[PDB]
Amino acid sequence: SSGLVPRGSHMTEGTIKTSKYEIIAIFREELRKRTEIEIFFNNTSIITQLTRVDFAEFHIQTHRKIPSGHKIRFLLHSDSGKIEFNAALTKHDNDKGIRYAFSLPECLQVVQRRRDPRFRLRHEHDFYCRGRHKNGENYLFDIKDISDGGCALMTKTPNLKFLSHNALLKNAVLMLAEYGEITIDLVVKNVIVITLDNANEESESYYQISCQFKFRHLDDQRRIEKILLDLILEA
Numbered sequence: 429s430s431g432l433v434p435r436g437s438h439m440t441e442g443t444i445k446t447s448k449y450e451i452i453a454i455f456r457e458e459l460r461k462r463t464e465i466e467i468f469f470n471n472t473s474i475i476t477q478l479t480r481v482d483f484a485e486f487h488i489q490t491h492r493k494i495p496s497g498h499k500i501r502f503l504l505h506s507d508s509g510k511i512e513f514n515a516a517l518t519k520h521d522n523d524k525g526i527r528y529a530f531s532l533p534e535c536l537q538v539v540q541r542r543r544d545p546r547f548r549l550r551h552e553h554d555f556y557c558r559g560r561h562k563n564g565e566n567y568l569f570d571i572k573d574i575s576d577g578g579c580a581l582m583t584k585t586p587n588l589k590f591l592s593h594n595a596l597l598k599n600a601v602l603m604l605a606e607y608g609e610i611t612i613d614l615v616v617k618n619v620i621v622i623t624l625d626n627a628n629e630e631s632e633s634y635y636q637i638s639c640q641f642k643f644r645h646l647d648d649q650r651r652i653e654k655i656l657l658d659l660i661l662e663a
């Protein structure tokens with residue numbers, strides 16, 4: 429839409445990686461960046477991180493007991509996109525954490541559909557979105573992340589009746605601290621339940637509202653582009 433495409437996170441609708449070397453280098457970078465990994469089986473997902481990686485296996489550490497028999501599904505929350513694969517269990521021993529070892533996958537799939545990178549607002553930044561629903565009821569949301577094309581809003585107290593898919597939040601106001609305020613339409617793309625971590629070992633539940641910007645004027649888009657560049661370069 430704008431042409432601006434910073435390096436990192438090139439789009440792919442689905443790229444298959446199969447080289448044992450690259451698969452290892454990828455696991456090593458995501459263990460280091462402490463990337464979130466998500467583990468799915470029998471209709472639910474654990475969520476952990478990697479503990480070590482070598483040339484035949486990767487290792488996690490979870491209080492839950494993971495099954496055995498066949499390969500189970502994984503999803504890495506990588507800055508390159510969602511990295512998915514299947515891996516089988518090979519070792520487990522008995523903080524009462526069960527050490528776990530999985531064979532490295534033979535192939536990974538990378539999917540990166542985001543045309544604009546998303547900046548995650550850290551506790552150094554306190555941005556909000558306020559507005560009025562169609563019935564005049566007021567709302568105020570924390571902004572979790574923001575990109576040239578939209579944002580994710582966090583709240584414990586959504587009014588779900590105004591948050592169906594593609595519902596419009598008309599004349600929301602982004603409150604971006606030193607950057608001022610911008611009035612904007614938001615199209616609701618998704619609503620999920622999320623567990624970020626509060627301070628500090630305590631994990632807490634939030635609703636996450638994924639939104640697309642519908643700009644009022646072309647200059648509002650350019651203004652957001654300048655804010656994101658500032659955010660990225662100053663952190």
Ligand SMILES: Nc1nc2c(ncn2[C@@H]2O[C@@H]3COP(=O)(O)O[C@H]4[C@@H](O)[C@H](n5cnc6c(=O)[nH]c(N)nc65)O[C@@H]4COP(=O)(O)O[C@H]3[C@H]2O)c(=O)[nH]1
Binds near residue numbers: 617
């Ligand atoms: N309709 C819609 N929903 C959105 C969008 N962005 C986030 N969500 C919802 O928010 C969930 C969490 O997103 P995430 O924390 O960034 O965590 C994501 C993210 O880390 C990653 N991921 C998935 N797809 C992509 C992608 O196309 N690009 C990138 N860079 N990462 C992706 O895998 C994790 C899980 O993905 P999901 O299972 O799909 O789960 C997503 C998804 O349900 C969006 O642009 N449109």
Ligand SMILES: Nc1nc2c(ncn2[C@@H]2O[C@@H]3COP(=O)(O)O[C@H]4[C@@H](O)[C@H](n5cnc6c(=O)[nH]c(N)nc65)O[C@@H]4COP(=O)(O)O[C@H]3[C@H]2O)c(=O)[nH]1
Binds near residue numbers: 573
């Ligand atoms: N900062 C931020 N912006 C958001 C969020 N959700 C939506 N947007 C903005 O709204 C645009 C369109 O969302 P979409 O229709 O669901 O269309 C999305 C969606 O279908 C898909 N996608 C991207 N990431 C994910 C993901 O993590 N999970 C899933 N299930 N789909 C994703 O790729 C399409 C386009 O991605 P985008 O180019 O990034 O384009 C996004 C993005 O600019 C959000 O949680 N945070």
